[PDB]
Amino acid sequence: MDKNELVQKAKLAEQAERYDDMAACMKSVTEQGAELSNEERNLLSVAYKNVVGARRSSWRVVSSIEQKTEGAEKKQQMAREYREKIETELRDICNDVLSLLEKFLIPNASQAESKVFYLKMKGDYYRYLAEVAAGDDKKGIVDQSQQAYQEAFEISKKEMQPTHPIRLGLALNFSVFYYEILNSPEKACSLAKTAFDEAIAELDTLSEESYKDSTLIMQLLRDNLTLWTS
Amino acid sequence: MDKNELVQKAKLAEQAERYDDMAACMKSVTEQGAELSNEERNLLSVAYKNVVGARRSSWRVVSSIEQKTEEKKQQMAREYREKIETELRDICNDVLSLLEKFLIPNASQAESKVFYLKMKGDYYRYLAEVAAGDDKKGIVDQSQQAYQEAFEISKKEMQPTHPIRLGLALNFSVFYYEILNSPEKACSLAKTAFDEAIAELDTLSEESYKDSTLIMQLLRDNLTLWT
Ligand SMILES: [Ca+2]
Ligand SMILES: [Ca+2]
Numbered sequence A: 001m002d003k004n005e006l007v008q009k010a011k012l013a014e015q016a017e018r019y020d021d022m023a024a025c026m027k028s029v030t031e032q033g034a035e036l037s038n039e040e041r042n043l044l045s046v047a048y049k050n051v052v053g054a055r056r057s058s059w060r061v062v063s064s065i066e067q068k069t070e071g072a073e074k075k076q077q078m079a080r081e082y083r084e085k086i087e088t089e090l091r092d093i094c095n096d097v098l099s100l101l102e103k104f105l106i107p108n109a110s111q112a113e114s115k116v117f118y119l120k121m122k123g124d125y126y127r128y129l130a131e132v133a134a135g136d137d138k139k140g141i142v143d144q145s146q147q148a149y150q151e152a153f154e155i156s157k158k159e160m161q162p163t164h165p166i167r168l169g170l171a172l173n174f175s176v177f178y179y180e181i182l183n184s185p186e187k188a189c190s191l192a193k194t195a196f197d198e199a200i201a202e203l204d205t206l207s208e209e210s211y212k213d214s215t216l217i218m219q220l221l222r223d224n225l226t227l228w229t230s
Numbered sequence B: 001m002d003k004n005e006l007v008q009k010a011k012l013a014e015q016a017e018r019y020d021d022m023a024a025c026m027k028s029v030t031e032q033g034a035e036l037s038n039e040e041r042n043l044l045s046v047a048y049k050n051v052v053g054a055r056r057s058s059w060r061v062v063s064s065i066e067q068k069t070e071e072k073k074q075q076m077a078r079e080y081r082e083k084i085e086t087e088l089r090d091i092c093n094d095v096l097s098l099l100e101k102f103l104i105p106n107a108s109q110a111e112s113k114v115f116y117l118k119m120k121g122d123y124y125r126y127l128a129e130v131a132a133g134d135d136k137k138g139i140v141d142q143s144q145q146a147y148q149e150a151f152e153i154s155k156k157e158m159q160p161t162h163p164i165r166l167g168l169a170l171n172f173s174v175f176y177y178e179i180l181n182s183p184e185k186a187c188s189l190a191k192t193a194f195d196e197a198i199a200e201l202d203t204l205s206e207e208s209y210k211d212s213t214l215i216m217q218l219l220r221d222n223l224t225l226w227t
């Protein structure tokens, strides 16, 4: 009921691996209208990542099965219908997150760190809608994802250090957007490489707190470069 | 809606790791009242094992947290445990109702009789893990009686290397160790099952050797742990 009580409840749900309970708790905290602490922001993000992620993973298995059944018209129809059922769940999750971002999280974000984080998150959830969209609505959704990422990108470039894990994480996800959604491997590689190289160049300005996360994300950036290069 | 379609939906749901959907499909298949095939009963078993399993795992983390508290936090942990318990009991009672109404009555073979009686033992055991005081003694006896009848039929009708007989021995030994706190009985049961399987090891066929030997390894791992 109370804010602090809902946060302790979310942490308990996290430990129980009951992420729908966790998402419900952090949604309620967000809806109280106060700016989320760094802890609360991370709890919200973890909760919804796991809720949407379960559907994404399932949709990837059912869509793959649907495509890899040629002659079975009845079996393919079942897979198609189950895929659509899963899509509807996924869309409702994404729309709940995107509504929270638009109504509470983005307008209340009083620091560049926070604003970049939430705009990146907006980019991610429009990207998850884009993964699942049919041709008519897809171009619009893809553009919404790109615009969110692009605004996040410009703010992080202006306000944040190249080694900042949120700036690096944005570069990772935006490069993935270009590769997987926009089919633009050259743009994806150049964004990823530039982010990696800028972090390498400013290796002095990197504190002992965000020293691990930063270097882990840099490794992921370069892993994508080597993968996409072949 | 038709059995064959529901079975295919269950398999789809399994691939998707959507186990509530899978359990719902196999529940409705069972409720048509025809004896389940080997494939169908295994789908039902996997579905509900995962559905109850999620609650059991959650109940193991929230119960522990409640234990290690000194406060408002304890009452929150208690109430969340109780909520998880309610879900868990409703799952177990669904499975146990399917077992009483459909599965155990229609079981035409000793193999399937043992399979379902073991299952009955398992789901009362999961209720026993979560019971306190009055109800527990009664819950524990139902588990034990299900296992005991299964055990007698398996010894009579199945070879020591049969995976269902071995799996029963494993779960019944775990019942003795974890529910009845009878470690000597648990070890004796597990040791006998392992040794008897080792002694008749030419009585396997190329199909079931992998499952049998995996359970044998789990039996011995428990013996090593429990010593
Ligand atoms: Ca859940
Ligand atoms: Ca599920």
Ligand SMILES: [Cl-]
Pocket: A017, A018, A019, A020, A021, A022
């Ligand atoms: Cl949940």
Ligand SMILES: [Cl-]
Pocket: A017, A018, A019, A020
């Ligand atoms: Cl969950």
Ligand SMILES: [Cl-]
Pocket: B017, B018, B019, B020, B021, B022
């Ligand atoms: Cl499900």
Ligand SMILES: [Cl-]
Pocket: B017, B018, B019, B020
């Ligand atoms: Cl599931």
